[PDB]
Amino acid sequence: AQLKGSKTEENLKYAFAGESQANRRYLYFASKADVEGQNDIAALFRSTAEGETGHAHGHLEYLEAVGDPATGLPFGTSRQNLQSAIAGETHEYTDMYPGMAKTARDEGFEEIANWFETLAKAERSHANRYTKALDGLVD
Amino acid sequence: AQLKGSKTEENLKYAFAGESQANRRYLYFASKADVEGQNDIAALFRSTAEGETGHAHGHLEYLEAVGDPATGLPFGTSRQNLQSAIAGETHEYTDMYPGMAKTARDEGFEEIANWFETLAKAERSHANRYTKALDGLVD
Ligand SMILES: [Fe+3]
Ligand SMILES: [Fe+3]
Ligand SMILES: [Fe+3]
Ligand SMILES: [Fe+3]
């Protein structure tokens, strides 16, 4: 059985997305506990978040055989990782965030539209900086 | 204009998932660069990952108006955050990971199936620990 094209590949991608979101959510929850003074709860959310990091890393290790869950491109070496990062960032600043900004404007969410435009600009900066790093990579 | 039910709500949920995965991916790429000896590349992946943390944070702040992207439940206070964490974890250990392990075993991925069962047990641990924290919460 080959993993590529299987239902298990799809489950690995979905589980990777869920573990990734769980780490971000739990760190957000930790910050809210911090401000409240619930320092024991904050520490618990932070420790659980590290568990989700280990889970996500494991899912990615299996995905190395089929490709980056964000781009479909190969990953592993620093050259491949930079190539995939550039591809994904380029999609985000040429397509994803500008399109979301337009929709938010159209629906009347002007501040959220401005947020999406800020992020389009930020991802363009990330893409350009990775491209410079790839140009200088000695491997 | 109300965010709930809009295309912009869906876009924020999708962007939150993507930024969360970008941080996890970039930290994975940094760990590969670490081992290779590409320390400048590793530092760049880690710095960019902190950018993605800021983006995911901001997406979550807008989603507070409509609910946790993983559960639909309200979030903000420690009591709300713990209830949402418990709900998400309970689904992972009762439904998601056991179902993924079965599909993996059927398709002949025995190691991946065992991985999914390890994570079902881990998420049950997380769920029970959050339940005990919520029972002791003094707010
Ligand atoms: Fe997990
Ligand atoms: Fe970026
Ligand atoms: Fe970002
Ligand atoms: Fe968990």
Side-chain angles (χ1 to χ4, degrees), chain A residues 26 28 36 64 78 89 97, chain B residues 19 26 28 36 64 78:
Chain A
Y26 294 166
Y28 189 93
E36 294 171 346
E64 246 188 59
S78 284
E89 291 284 359
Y97 278 124
Chain B
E19 298 297 319
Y26 293 165
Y28 187 88
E36 292 173 354
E64 268 196 36
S78 278

Side-chain angles (χ1 to χ4, degrees), chain A residues 28-42 45-46, chain B residues 64 75-82 134 137-139:
Chain A
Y28 189 93
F29 298 161
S31 71
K32 302 298 266 201
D34 288 337
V35 165
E36 294 171 346
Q38 298 276 2
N39 40 9
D40 295 320
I41 294 303
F45 276 124
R46 287 180 167 101
Chain B
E64 268 196 36
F75 68 102
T77 70
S78 278
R79 185 171 292 280
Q80 294 174 320
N81 298 338
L82 286 167
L134 179 57
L137 181 67
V138 176
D139 57 351

Side-chain angles (χ1 to χ4, degrees), chain A residues 18-19 22 52, chain B residues 87-98 120 123:
Chain A
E19 298 301 317
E52 315 302 26
Chain B
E89 291 285 358
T90 298
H91 172 73
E92 290 181 34
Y93 84 77
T94 68
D95 280 23
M96 197 190 74
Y97 274 127
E123 303 298 352

Side-chain angles (χ1 to χ4, degrees), chain B residues 63-75:
Chain B
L63 289 168
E64 268 196 36
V66 297
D68 185 338
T71 68
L73 296 170
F75 68 102

Side-chain angles (χ1 to χ4, degrees), chain B residues 6-18:
Chain B
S6 64
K7 290 197 252 217
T8 293
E9 174 182 30
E10 297 305 301
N11 282 336
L12 283 160
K13 301 205 300 192
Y14 188 85
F16 174 69

Side-chain angles (χ1 to χ4, degrees), chain A residues 89 92 97 119 122-123 126, chain B residues 19 22 48 51-53 55-56 59:
Chain A
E89 291 284 359
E92 289 186 60
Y97 278 124
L119 269 50
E123 303 300 348
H126 291 173
Chain B
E19 298 297 319
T48 308
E52 312 307 23
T53 302
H55 294 160
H59 296 321

